[PDB]
Design a protein around this nucleic acid. Structure first.
Lengths: 199, 207
RNA sequence: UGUAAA
């Protein structure tokens, strides 16, 4: 069978991974309004924002869990961020993953990113995003591309102090846009096609 | 010699798919295809009996996509006013999923022409599991469910540039824009309404 | 899912 028809992915116990911390790494925007202001500034000058995010998966008791960065108590995001202009998507994601999650011991982590799982577009300088370019939207302000990041068997991660890292089970995310937004809450669907091996 | 350049990105990273105007396709009518069950009560009754003699039900469904003015539409079957379903149905025990789907596709939409109807089915887009003898299905196997009652598999069916389809007289055919499925999720159920999310990874060529 | 710990 083609990898196109069946895609097999190895998951490892959450306990295969040890998590340390590093110095805080704050977002470039300090508020929602600031975020859209900078989105506006840069659109004018570089064009559509290109964002990439990684979906790292571990299992617990043969159950897939997605790793999420928690900010405060009520906000969660996938590890990722903004591509520099002209930057390659996967190369850019590896860069961003190391920045946010890379161990500190000089041992450089090797990210395996071979799978695109989805795409979301932001038509305006506003919160709504859609898994398709909406009708007659010729100039989307942001394009967000999600990848499956296959974790090695064991790894060491370093979480900037300002974040917590959590492993959310799929049932927690499914049907829970009010808690995770439409992008994170539909990862269970986006991941369903994959043939997961537990270990 | 000459190097014939193919797509650089792996197929796992970039899946390119040709879509064609809905106007490229011819639609006709054929003999009605009645559902094997007469009522919800009958449905889960027959499902219970079969689980005992055949094991877990295995369903396959196909997602056929066309475009109108460069917006993707999924082809849906509508029964009466109240029910949308993807073309597909039940595998026989042991039947290959993809061969089964082609069988079912041909049966529900196949042209009664005498012309070869060939389906291109190279992509799995998702899996849904029914943990009890009840309607609810999940895009994952829930905790503590070792014996799901049904496994449903979704496939992307690539259409040729032109094709003829015959629709069973008792069904209507609908091309549903992705924004409809997404903006009005309640109307299509959890499987069809999350098709825009499941299709988003594809690089659709418009023609 | 948003800045109250962030």
């Amino acid at each position: 069978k083609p990898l196109t028809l069946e895609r097999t992915i190895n998951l490892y116990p959450l306990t295969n991974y040890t998590f340390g911390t590093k110095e805080p790494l704050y977002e470039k925007d300090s508020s929602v309004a600031a975020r859209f202001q900078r989105m506006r500034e840069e659109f004018d000058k570089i064009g559509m924002r290109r964002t990439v995010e990684g979906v790292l998966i571990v299992h617990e008791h043969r159950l897939p869990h997605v790793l999420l960065l928690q900010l405060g108590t009520t906000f969660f995001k996938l590890p990722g961020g903004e591509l520099n202009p002209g930057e390659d998507e996967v190369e850019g994601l590896k860069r961003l993953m190391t920045e946010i999650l890379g161990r500190q011991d000089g041992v450089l982590q090797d990210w395996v990113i071979d799978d695109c799982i989805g795409n979301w577009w932001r038509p305006n300088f506003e919160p709504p995003q859609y898994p398709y370019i909406p009708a007659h939207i010729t100039k989307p302000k942001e394009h967000k591309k999600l990848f499956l990041v296959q974790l090695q068997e064991k790894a060491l991660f370093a979480v900037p102090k300002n974040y917590k890292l959590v492993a959310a089970p799929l049932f927690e995310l499914y049907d829970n846009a009010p808690g995770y937004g439409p992008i994170i809450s539909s990862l269970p669907q986006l991941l369903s096609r994959f043939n997961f091996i537990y270990n």
